[PDB]
Structure formats: structure tokens, C-alpha cells
Amino acid sequence: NLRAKLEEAMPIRRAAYSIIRTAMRAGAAGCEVIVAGKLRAQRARANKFKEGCLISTGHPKRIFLAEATRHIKMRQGVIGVKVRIYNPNIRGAVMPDKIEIGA
Amino acid sequence: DLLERNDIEVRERDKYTVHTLGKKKNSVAVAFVKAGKGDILVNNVPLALVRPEILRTKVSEPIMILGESLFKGLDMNIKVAGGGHVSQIYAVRQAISRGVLASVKDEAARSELRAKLVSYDRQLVVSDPRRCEAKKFGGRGARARRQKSYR
Amino acid sequence: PEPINARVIEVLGRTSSRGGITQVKVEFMTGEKRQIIRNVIGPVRKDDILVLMESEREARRLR
Amino acid sequence: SSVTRVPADVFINSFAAHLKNRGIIKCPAFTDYVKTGVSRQYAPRDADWFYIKAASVIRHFYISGSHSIGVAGLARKYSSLQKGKTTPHHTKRASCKVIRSIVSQFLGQKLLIAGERGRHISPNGRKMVEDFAEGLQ
Amino acid sequence: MHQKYTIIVVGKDLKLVERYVKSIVKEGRAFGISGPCRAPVRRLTITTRKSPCGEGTNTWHRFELRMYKRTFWVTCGGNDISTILSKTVVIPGIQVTVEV
Amino acid sequence: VALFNKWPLTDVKCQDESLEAYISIDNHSFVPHSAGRWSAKRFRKAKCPVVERLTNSLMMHGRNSGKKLMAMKTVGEAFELINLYTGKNPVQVLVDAVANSGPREDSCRIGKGVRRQSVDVSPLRRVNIGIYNIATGARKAAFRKVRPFAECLAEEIMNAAAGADKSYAISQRNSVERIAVSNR
RNA sequence: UCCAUUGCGACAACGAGCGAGACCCCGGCCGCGGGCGCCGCGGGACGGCCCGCGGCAGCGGGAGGACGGCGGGGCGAUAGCAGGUCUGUGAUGCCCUCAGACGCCCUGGGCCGCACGCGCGCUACACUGGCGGGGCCAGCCGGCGCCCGCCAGGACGCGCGGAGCCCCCGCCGUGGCCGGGACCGCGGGCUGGAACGCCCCCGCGCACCAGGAAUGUCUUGUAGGCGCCCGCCCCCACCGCG
């Protein structure tokens, strides 16, 4: 969806925020989109747009983090986008660190 | 050689009361104990005649500390596989000690006999936990590393 | 003068900036039983008996 | 059993004299001047080595029992390192012909019988091996 | 009739293979299906340098594909076990093969 | 217990009351091959048969690393060659050799800016250096000579036990101690 | 205080989050179930106990216990490098090229040359060793037989299977010697379409007798010694990964 928006020439912040809200409404505790490449410049930047809480390391990254990589193509040159979505409640398993405790 | 199910494959039945396992450095010994005349056999060979001629006393060491009379009246068939010669001499002394102790079982005499062995040599009746460590990339050795050419 | 043995009463600490010197208070095992402090190399512990070559020389207290 | 009760070396040496006295094997004398194993470099200095190797090979086939080990397997039992090269040394099998000659004599002698795949010790040969062992004891 | 049909279950994931085991044992328990014979795991391994180029201290990614295989023994009528295959829970990406 | 099925530990008591605690004959087992972990714990090393420590010191230089079976064979032949000449218990002659080969004074900087000062060698270090020096003098002596390792090891022990300066180990002790007396 | 913003006691801060830990793979120990094959599911260990010391967090021991205080790995914060890869890629901007091609093939040859400087390694410098027979010991994981050939290797078949070191007895015996095995002349094989590749047999017998100034790795199953497998691969490892 983000790749299409970027090819529709949506602003990178506008396109990324739209993807973030849809994931957050679907209940991801954190959504992070990183767009990297020559963003309207001959120098290369790496603007990362992130909201919520996203885990970074451990076996839970395999279970609770959906990491998707695209290579959207623009006229100036390839703009690679990574969308990372983390859901602690995926039904099948629980976060090891989280302790549910009791009343 | 690797913890295979081949206990009865060497010998069929023979009223082997116990089937102990003694393991040192990837070498396992299944020892079968029945009433006998004090004979002990390892790998279908007399225990006294063992390959490391220098370490042939280590194999007979549990018999000496416990006493020949207690050993008399037992026949042990030991099959050692895996590991190497010195560990196979350590595995059989451990297997003999565990198996002879099994005859006393939960008795107060066993508690004394376990203590008697544990005093002369501890870990004679207790497995040694040390096991080989893996090679890691950038070193020929498990922990050794390649020589740094610069810096 | 033959060396006189002395037993460690307290292991004061690790010195020489590489830790290899150990500071120990040693009470002469026999004789006047003076409690002097002497530098030691190696592994040392309480009740270790070491023969002091001169014993009339003592390291700075807890230094 | 028996061949185990007598140390392996004290049996092999006595059996070598026995297998030269009874006329068993009979050295080819063409393999007498050959060196067993590509691995070695200077050839056996024993001069009665064929008989020691012959008594050792029957003793192996006896402990094998119905395993029926092959001649190539016996060559891997006499494998050693090929030392004397700048490249690091590795294990190299023994000469197949020498062992093949030894097993051939036993089959003709009927000390060892032929079997599916490798040959194995015959009952008639086993009788000779165990009587010798108990006699040494 | 009465022949012996060898079922072999080859699966990459242990929990998935254990589930196939539960269904196969349950369907054939009446037909005297044998308890699972677990094969030594096939830990096929590829170790590759992490870098596309040769730059940096050479690092290595140790990838292991473990394949878990269960052999099953049932002796009975062939038609019943053909239906038994439909009855057992179907696990996607996990394969069963029958050899007489 | 008769080490090498020939020598008891009954008369083997160390006279040096400073070094007696760190030399142990109680744990002796015929054939010095106990696989007990001496590396574990700061002072578990002390509670080890002295003869086993010598058998661990003998296997050095890399070309001979790990071959305990060959080292303990040498210890037995060396002990027989000590029994043959000294005419005394060879476990007891080793105990006297370890006691003498150990220097009591060393030189270390002591928080100085290269200026070494006098220190006192610990009673465990005295035992560890003493055995190491015995084995290293023999090692150097047999490197290019028809004389076997067993013969030179037998002779350093026989020389150390009296205190003869021919022992590479006693010369080392007197050098270490003298540098310590001057740096005092 | 801790391996650690690891905690505790505080505190214009008050609540969070990421990394740390947890997690994951393996190992060792014990149950249960299964079994062509040891392989599936659980437990066990937590600084819990004891003694001292510490508001505390913990600390030093003693124990019991396969196992003791980060057992070894996998994963890897935040912000960057103008580090490297366009020759891994129907990844790719732009420039060049674009039928006398920078497409794609085909034969031959190079990359492997070499006054030399340097970085990994390998084998030695011997007697704790070399050389002859004999015993014989694994693990990642794994086919064999028979006959011929000095081996190398081959033919013809089939359904299978296993190390060095070390131990034991001889020999040489301090001699650049039988240490060492570089070179170099015939010869025997192999693989492929083709050697210049590899293997092997009798020669041949180099330095090196322990390495200056420097410098590197390592605390238990570790160093080191000693084999073995796999990756690439017609053949080929002094390499890497196990």
C-alpha cells in the first residue's frame, strides 16, 4: 500500500503516517515504516517514521514482529521501504517478558 | 556406539539383575551384574588385561577400596562404546562402582559404601560433567582465535 | 640470620597496580610473635606460613 | 573367550611360530620383499612378518565371528599415517594384496570359510585357535 | 486384504509433525497402528558468510534445516488406511507417503 | 596405596612446617592419573597428589602436550632410578626436592614508577615454582643428549633433595632469592 | 551494588518504552511415553538453604546437589560511517557501449608468471624422537564384497559400514644421522574432450641444530598436541566450517 502511495507521489510523512494508523487501528502495539534512498536530493537520507512500542531483539522478534521489505522505484532511484509491525497478542503465544500476574 | 539400544544384543538374558550406565567424555559403559565367583569382564575380555597397561590399576581401583570379599560373588559383563581409551577406563571404574553399589541399594551399608568410595575418590560414583566445546568462526580452537596481522 | 616463618592473620589486599603483590599482616609463628605487614607474590590465604628472609622490613600499612 | 584370556600379543607371536611350523599360509616370498601399506616407507624388518600378520588376521576373523569382515576392512585395520610430506599427514589403508593372499590361504586351508560378502572363520579353524589359546594358559 | 503399509511423515517443524503423529495414532489405534518411530533428525546445514562482499571480519550465518520423520506401521485392509489418510488431520506443508 | 604398585605414602611427611600444608600424600592413587579438576577453585590445586602435579608439569613444549600416560611412565622409571641410587623411598625424596626448589623471596615493582622491591613468595607458589623448576631443568638437559628424560628428571630430584647447586632448579632458587635480597 | 541505566535507596520531576535480562538452540541430569534408528514431551537451579557481613541491592564463604552463581552459542538498542559490495541479483539512477557488439558463443593462452618486500598457514629442527610389527579408540556423522596390481588404481558385482594419538615389544642410537623432506631424473596410474591437475614407485637428499627488534592467541575439557568430516569440486586443502 505504501509503495503505491509513494508511486502516487504521496509525501513520505503523509504516506507513512497513513500506513501507521491502519496498523495501530488493527491493534499493532507499534508500527514503524523506514523509507531510505535519495529523497528529493542527490544525497541519500534514511527517514524512519515510528509510533507506539516496537521490540527489537530476541526470539520474540521472529514470533511477534512482521518485518516486510519493499524496493519502491522512483525516477531518481530505488527507495527501499521497511514496515515493521509488532503485535504482543497474536493469540498463539505470549511475550516472554510480560508477566500477567493476578488479583 | 552413540547410546544405541544394544544392551541385550551382546548377551541374551542370563538373569542380569542390574544394567548400570557409566559415562565419561562421550564414552558409555552398560554393566550387567549377576551372582558370580568374583569375575569381572569388559568388552568380552578380563578386566585385569586392559589396553592402557599403565591405567589397568584405575579399572581395579573400586575393588581395592570396597574390598575383594564384597566383590566376590558377582559377575559383571561390561560393554564400552564411544569416547577413547582413558575415558573408557574412567567409565568402567564408574560403572563397576555404581553397579556393585546397586546390590546394596538403599541400605545403610550402601550409604557407607557410597561414602567409602566418595572419600577415596569423589566422582567415582558421580558422573563428571565436562564435555567438549564447539569451534567458533575466526578460530581453529573453541576459544583460541587467528593471529591478528595488524594491531 | 636464618629466615623466620610467619602465619597470615589478615589478608589486607591486592597491590602493585597489577594486583600481583598481596598485602598480608603476618605474626611471627615463633619468638616475640610481632605482627608485621609484608608483601607476598602468588596465591595466599589466612594461616599461610611463609619464611620471612629478614622480617625487620615492613610494607606501608594497608598500602 | 580363550583368545581373550591370553593377552592379544602373547597369542599372536606364539601363533606366528605355530603357523610357520605347521606350514600354514606359506609366505608367497614375492610379497616378502614388498612393504605393506602405501603409508609406510622402509618395509617390515621382521622377516617373519608374514606369519605375525597371518596369525593376527585369523585372530581378527575369530573375534569377528559371524560378522564376516572383508579384506578391505582388514586393510583399514592396518592403516597408518603417511608421514614424511610437507602437507599434513593423513591415514592411508594397508596393501590389499598382502591381506588378500593371507585370507586366500585360510580359505584353501579351510581354517576360514567363505560367506555372503566377506569370508568368516570356519568351525574347523576356530578349533585350532581356541585350543592354542587354552594351551598358552 | 492383509499387507503391511509403511507411512512416512516428513516435516520441518516438530510441533506440526507431533500433531500429524497424534491424528495418525488416533485413527489407526483400533487398526493396531504402531507408536511413532522417530528418525534421527536430519539437521541439513548450510553455513554462509553474512556479507555479500568480503569486507569486515569474516562472519558466518549458521542455518540448520532440521527434518523430522516418523515411520508408521499398520497391518490391515488397504481400503481402510486409504480412508484413514482422509480422516487424519491434514497439515499443510507436511507430507505423508505409503510404501508396501 | 602403593604408587606405581611399589611405594607407600606412610613415611612421606614433609619436614618443612611452612610447606607441609600445601604438599599432600593423603589423596595418592596408584598411577597419578586422577582426572580431578584442579583448575576449579583458587586452592583446590593444593589438595592434589604431589606426584600428579609433577606428571602435569612434565608434559610441556607443545610437541608433548597432553600425553599424561607417557609422563607418568617417566615418573615411575625416574622413581626406580632414584630408588636404585638413593636407596630411599622416592616419593619422600621428591617431597624434599619440592621443598628445597621453592624460593621464599621474589622481586616485583610494588607500585613503583622499573624499580623492583623485595616480596615474600606464597607457600603455594613455592610448591608450584619448585615442581616447575625441577621439570624444566630436566627438559633443557635432555633436549639434545643421549641421556633420557627419565635419567635427568631422576638426577634433578636427587640433587634438589640434598640441595646441590648442579640442580637447574636450585640455581634458579638462589638467583631469584639473591636478586630479591639486593632489590630489598 | 552489578557482567549490565543490574538493581536499591533517593530525588522537579512523575509515569513509560527500546536495548540488558527474559527469549531461543544446544549440552549434562532425571521421569514419562514411544521406538527399523534414541527420540518425543516434561522436570531440575532459584543466589533457594546455612553461617558471617550488609537499610538495601547484594557480598564472602560453606554446603547439598549431574549441574552454582553470564555452560557454550543465536538474536541484537540509539545515532551515524559519505566503511564495503553496481562483478550475487528482471535490485537500480545516469554515463558509456549497443551487428567491425562491452550481446552470446567458439579455439588457443593467461589469472598459477616472478631481481624482491610483506600477511595467514604448513612441516621441521629430533630420543618425551624416528623407524618396523602388534593392540586399538571416536564424534559431526557415516555403504560394501571379491579378484588383480608394488602402490596408485582397475575389472566384475552387490547391499551395506568406523580414527589418529596413545599403549606394547624390537631397532637406531646425539651423527645434519635412519632427524627433516625441499628439490630433481626415468617410470606406473587417474580425471576430462584435452594437463600444465592430482596420485604413486625407485632413486635424489635443500635449508632448519630452536629463530633478533618486535608481535599474537589463550583460564577446563580451555590452551596445546592429535586425527576426521564437510563447503567449493573433472581431479585437487598446507584453506574455511564443523
**Contact in structure between B20 and B80 (CB atoms under 8 Å):** no
How far is F161 from F177, CA to CA, in rounded Å?
A: 18
Task: Report DSSP state, residue E88.
Answer: S
Q: What resolution does the deposited structure have, in angstroms?
A: 3.3
Residue appearing with cell numbers 503423529: E21
Q: What are phi and psi of F145, to 5 degrees?
A: -125, 155
Task: Tally the domains of chain B.
Answer: 1
Q: List the Cα angle D76/D81/D87 in 5-degree steps.
A: 135
For residue B142, is it within any domain? yes
Q: Name the experimental technique.
A: cryo-EM
Which are the contacts of D123, defined by CB distance < 8 A and separation ≥ 6?
A: D113
β-pair type (A45-52, A30-37): antiparallel
For residue B126, is it within any domain? yes
Contact between C41 and F122 using a beta-carbon 8 Å cutoff: yes
For residue D34, is it within any domain? yes
Q: Do chains D and A touch (3 or more CB pairs under 8 A)?
A: no
For residue D124, is it within any domain? yes
Q: What are phi and psi of A72, to 5 degrees?
A: -60, 140
D9–B contact, CB cutoff 8 A: no
List the CATH number of the domain containing A5.
3.30.1140.32
Residue nearest to nucleotide G92 (CA to C1'): A78
CA of B127 to C1' of G45 (A): 18
CA of A92 to C1' of G15 (A): 31
Q: Residue A12: which domain range?
A: 1-86
The identity of residue B91, as a single letter, is A
Q: Residue B81: which domain range?
A: 17-151
Instruction: Say whether A72 sits in a helix, a strand or coil.
Output: strand
Burial class of residue F32 in the structure, from the number of CB atoms within 10 Å of its CB (0-12 exposed, 13-18 middle, 19+ buried): buried
Q: Residue D53: which domain range?
A: 2-131
Task: Tally the domains of chain D.
Answer: 1
For residue A93, is it within any domain? no
The identity of residue A49, as a single letter, is F
For residue B146, is it within any domain? yes
3-state secondary structure labels for all residues of chain F:
CCECCCECCCCCCCCCCCCCCCCECCCCCCCCCCCCCCCCCCCCCCCCEHHHHHHHHHCCCCCCCCCHHHHHHHHHHHHHHHHHHHCCCHHHHHHHHHHHHCCCEEEECCCCCCCCEEEEECCCHHHHHHHHHHHHHHHHHCCCCCCCHHHHHHHHHHHHHHCCCCCHHHHHHHHHHHHHHHCC
Task: Tally the domains of chain A.
Answer: 1
For residue A95, is it within any domain? no
Per-residue flag: B81 CB under 7 A of strand G = yes
Task: Tally the domains of chain C.
Answer: 1
**Contact in structure between D76 and D132 (CB atoms under 8 Å):** no
C16–F contact, CB cutoff 8 A: yes
CA of D88 to C1' of G175 (A): 28
Please, which residues bridge with residue D80 across strands?
D92
Residue appearing with cell numbers 591381506: D99
- Nucleotide with smallest C1' distance to residue E18 CA: G40
Cross-chain CB nearest to C39 (options F120, F126, F128) = F120
Task: Report DSSP state, residue B46.
Answer: B
Per-residue flag: B137 CB under 7 A of strand G = yes
For residue B5, is it within any domain? no
Q: Residue C48: which domain range?
A: 2-61
Chain E 36-95, CB < 7 Å to strand G: 36-41, 43, 47, 51-53, 55-56, 58, 60-62, 68-69, 71, 73
For residue D75, is it within any domain? yes
Per-residue flag: B26 CB under 7 A of strand G = yes
